[PDB]
Design a protein around this ligand. Sequence first.
Ligand SMILES: COc1ccc([C@@]2(c3cccc(-c4cncnc4)c3)CCC(N)=N2)cc1
Length: 376
Amino acid sequence: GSFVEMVDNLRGKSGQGYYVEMTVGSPPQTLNILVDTGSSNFAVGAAPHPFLHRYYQRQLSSTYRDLRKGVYVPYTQGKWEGELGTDLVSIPHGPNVTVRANIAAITESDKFFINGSNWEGILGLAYAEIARPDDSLEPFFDSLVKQTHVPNLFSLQLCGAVGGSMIIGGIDHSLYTGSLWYTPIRREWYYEVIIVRVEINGQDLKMDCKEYNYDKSIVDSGTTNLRLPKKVFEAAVKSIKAASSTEKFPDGFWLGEQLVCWQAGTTPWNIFPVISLYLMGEVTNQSFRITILPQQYLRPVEDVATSQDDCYKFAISQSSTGTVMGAVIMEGFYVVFDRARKRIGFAVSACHVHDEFRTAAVEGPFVTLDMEDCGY
Ligand SMILES: COc1ccc([C@@]2(c3cccc(-c4cncnc4)c3)CCC(N)=N2)cc1
């Protein structure tokens, strides 16, 4: 069960996350599980639901242990509730190991599961500090590291159309090209990082760098969009509207509320600007940038009914809880969650986005002498 078995172990549907096959219980029950760097619970559907193909049946698992403790999680988009226990867990196309881990058996939920997403649970890969009900509930990756000899690192290569790879324990050098650039993990809760500069077609947004990270910035495979604090979002939208002015779109497009469509194969990519996010480097006032093409931030919406055309949602939206570098930002980068060294590395992925004019990039180094601290 080494890296060379772990490649192409992820699948997905656009806008609905990326999932990996896992088993829970004894005999193993196979479940598809969303890979979520934005949370820290292993939480699996454990009762029937209109949107679940299958669910964890605790009664059929000999090795299940009830912890006699409930968990209730209301969050922005929805809610879920369940019962805590432990059981044996493996990742068939992941490391060749079986561990005993905490499992939240989801017994009731509202707008948590998605119709036709093909996943039945979430694997929260962030740290204990944001586990529910509290930080005493050891996250899965912590249990994995403790119980096996797996190195304390994983990587995600997410690809647009979807699929990709989660490599646990090391770095698969066949999954990226060029250099890996690291940004520090600021605090171990979410995967919190610091953005030092934003450019839109090379034009600096010219804001105090604290605004980019009000009130935190995170790398979150469980969020589709690039989410930006209000001030930054409004400035970004003004610049992208300015760059793309040869065409005018309804306000609903800018709000993520409606599609823009063009005749099949005629999307005018080159009227849309590239977005550069400069991330704090590992040494003082050094940074690197990751560049995001419109092929990333205009997310295609597959629909047989609209298929004479190519249609997209604007996958950048306003946030009141900080910046979220979601799946559209991670797509086409090889992203290394180097927990052992408290850092996230970015490199150009095997499935990077490009046309004949422009390519997604990871480039550095950059220096800024006149710098304050960019964190809140
Ligand atoms: C432990 O409680 C939660 C609450 C919310 C989540 C969440 C989540 C919950 C359900 C579905 C999705 C999701 C939906 N669409 C696409 N990707 C992920 C995402 C919200 C934010 C994030 N990173 N994960 C995960 C665990």
